[PDB]
RNA sequence: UGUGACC
């Protein structure tokens, strides 16, 4: 509860000259004491008159009423961070180093200087694109400066060491003053012209860091970072973050987990002897000295210091540092500058064409229904994203412009424009326009947004290599239901004294131009193969579309801006847009390890216990016949390198006995870490979100990186929560929303009131809001209906249906209709619309919160009907596994001690269901959980239907409704439906063991009938009980259960009503990964 | 309609 109470002390500290708490109650006599109050205090308040006395004779409203929210009258002029900031700025400000980066427009020089006039003006390499100002982060930090200014012992050493690094912020701000922001939250010229460019975006990311510092050592490195990054703004991440790759190949291994069979961890106490060649002692300290050079001292000297021992107990710093380097912020280069940088192939095509074959073989032989129908299939898939252009489109009796290629895909069909047969040129006559990537750290990256045509030509077979990556072990990031915990038991199972790791970033060869003839041409050369494998018409074709894709893409053409200009350029790189993206990148990535490790095999001889590509690397682990020594490491090192360098590709390769790192994930001494560093105040582009939807998704990214090992101080997110979340209803009237209603599950929810702990209501004012805000979830739109109701609409709607089923639709067609009017979402001013809804409405209900017939059922309800039936009891959980993910916080870390960890996402879309595979055998159509969930609970002559109206044959349609299976996916999809409303798969659940048996011990629950939903959700929200428990207090209970028989019918009942919620909680989940 | 692919 203590967030409701921070509230005020932050608006106490922002504003000095009202606030008027408003409550509100489930009960009615209680409400009008709150309605009563609420009055009295805007009147006193329109009088100067001491509110103190209706405290007291409202205490009861105090006492027992829920705080809604807190009304703020502030009569200043959003000024005060002006005045406030002088305080701090004592120091001297920093001066840019102008002689630091290369490009002239990375070094911080004056606005101005980079750009004359104001028409030449861009914030496009600066532009926080966030929706919070630089003005209101300041005003965060000083707010906590205060409030820690009476603080004793270490955490006023926390204090000081912040104190110090927020002057330097301070004083180089206050030289030019505080940039002010417009409505868009944006820097525009006129603000910018006097201030040093990255004045901004440098403050957030100091900020940032600064309020991340805790230890001597944070201290330290935030204040370096700060400093070199004020002037350093291209090469600090990667220097700060380059030792690292070699630092994991130093420590030893004293104990580690492995997989099993089982594809499970398993605790291996051996020991690894870490064997490193001389040789890379000098590259590391030629990093070393590249640090130096640029500036760094602190830090070098860290490394040097852990490197006389080299211990995996005080290589936690190595992490730190590791992670801290991309909190500098993203490197934002010029399109042109980012587009600039871009025989013996025979073996590496040979096997891209290959691997091509053997994921569609099976597909193509037996006529795959999915390859047929490949067509229909993309325009389901087919997403609102752009197409390019920006073209005129007439809807109804509308004449708007959209790029959104939802759209352009209806207007063309409309007007017999519509020719998927006919794959557009990419060439010089059709320059491909342009998207970027950035990222900390990194240089930038270009992308192609390509027609829809192309995506429609590759979507299916995508999806069918997908599938064979699916299952096959090589594809790390597709494999199985597996989490990134099973690709660390893999890498050091089989380590050991006669076997060395092989890693390698091969991100500098996808995009080598070397690549892309080898590429396009082994995938083609498969195409072929393929095609001279059926006679059909339907797969010769899309087999056939696909094969021009990589045609055209051979020889492409780019369309660069330059200023205001856009030359045209021939790229001849591959750059990705495409849908075979990743998947081709691992094929290829994959075919390229494979073609080295068979050419060093002249050489040495070495037995293969494992390859892996992973995203932008690949790895493997290989078996000598006896034992490593250093110089046999250097030796197969040198050749591998040297067989890389015959390719012309720019990449790092290096060797080891004892660890691994890559972009994802990178294992030390035994351990796995994951880097911390996903920026809080500066985001890559700006999207389509809300302020709201921004605060939870701060706030997801501060869970992440906490459970990473970077932690912000929870006071700097819950204050910015505060700001991003309040409603101005007028200029000096702020509305500010409560801990009710930011951290209930509802559709409004934000973060949780505990972090690690998702809480559902179990009191009646709790449920009484829940029900409220969903009143108000969905808002109309009126430019969405007048397009939702245009021919060229409905026919596109229709046209699909046609194609797609055989008899009625309804459950289906209802559902095209409405995911075809969602995507109509990416359209700004519908958007807009619906913003502006959702505030007034917001703005109505935090005022006096009104009423609602319920009558829908959500996950809450149900689990507030089980809980009066348990009883709880002291217990005690010995901790038994050793931890093997350092950085996670310790009321994590215990959990995971005590009952294990998993390395497997739980199933919550339904697709292991007898019923979804069907569809699947038949049908292009893929149903969500949530349809799943609603047809596998009709009468048995209704699924039926459902099923022959999808194409499903009679025979399997019948064989299905009856037997045993069925009976099963009716429990199989309501445990996956269910497992998905818990979020069972994010945040901290994602990595505990819920079939511990270790937990299950503490699970006491008699079965008094039989009947799966009942016993099901009992044995989980038992289990989430005593997790949660855990998580807050470090011991455990035992619970038991004694829910009557007469009841487990009543219940089983309500579980096939269940309501999904959305909320900006929940889209911050899924917007993670 | 300051917007910019795959996922």
Redesign the pocket.
Known sequence: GKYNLILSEYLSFIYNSVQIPIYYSSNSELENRCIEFHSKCLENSKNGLSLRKLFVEYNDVIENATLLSILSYSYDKYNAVERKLVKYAKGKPLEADLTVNELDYENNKMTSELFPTAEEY??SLM?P?ILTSLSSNLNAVMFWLEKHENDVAEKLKVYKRRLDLFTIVASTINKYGVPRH???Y?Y?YDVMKDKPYYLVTWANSSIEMLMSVFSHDDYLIAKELIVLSYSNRSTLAKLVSSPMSILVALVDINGTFITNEELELEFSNKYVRAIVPDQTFDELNQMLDNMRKAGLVDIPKMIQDWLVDRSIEKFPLMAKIYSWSFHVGFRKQKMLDAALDQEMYREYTMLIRDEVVKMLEEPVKHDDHLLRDSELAGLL???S???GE?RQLKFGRKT??????NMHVMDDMANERYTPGIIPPVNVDKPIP????DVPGRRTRI????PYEY?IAQ?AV?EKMLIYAKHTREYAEFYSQSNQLLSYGDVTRFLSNNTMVLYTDVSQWDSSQHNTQPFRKGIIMGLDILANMTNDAKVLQTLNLYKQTQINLMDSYVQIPDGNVIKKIQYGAVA???????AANSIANLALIKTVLSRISNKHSFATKIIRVDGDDNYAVLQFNTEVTKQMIQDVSNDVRETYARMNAKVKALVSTVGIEIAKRYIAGGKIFFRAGINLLNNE????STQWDQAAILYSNYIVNRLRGFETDREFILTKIMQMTSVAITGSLRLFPSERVLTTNSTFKVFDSEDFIIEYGTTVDEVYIQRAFMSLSSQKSGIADEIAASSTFKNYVTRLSEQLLFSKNNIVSRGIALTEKAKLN????IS?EKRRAQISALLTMLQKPVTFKSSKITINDILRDIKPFFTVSDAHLPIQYQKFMPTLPDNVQYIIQCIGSRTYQIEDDGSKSAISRLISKYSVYKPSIEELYKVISLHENEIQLYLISLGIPKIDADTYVGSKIYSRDKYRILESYVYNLLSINYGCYQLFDFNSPDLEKLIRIPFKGKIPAVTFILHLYAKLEVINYAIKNGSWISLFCNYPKSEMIKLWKKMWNITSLRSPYTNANFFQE
Request: charged fraction near 30%.
């Open positions: 861009t914030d532009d694109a417009n409505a868009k944006r525009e898939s087919m997403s994203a752009s197409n920006s708007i412009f959209s790029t959104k290629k342009l998207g970027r990537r992308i192609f947004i390509l995506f979507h995508v990705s847009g495409e849908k075979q993206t990743k582009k700006r999207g389509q990416s359209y700004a001013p807009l």
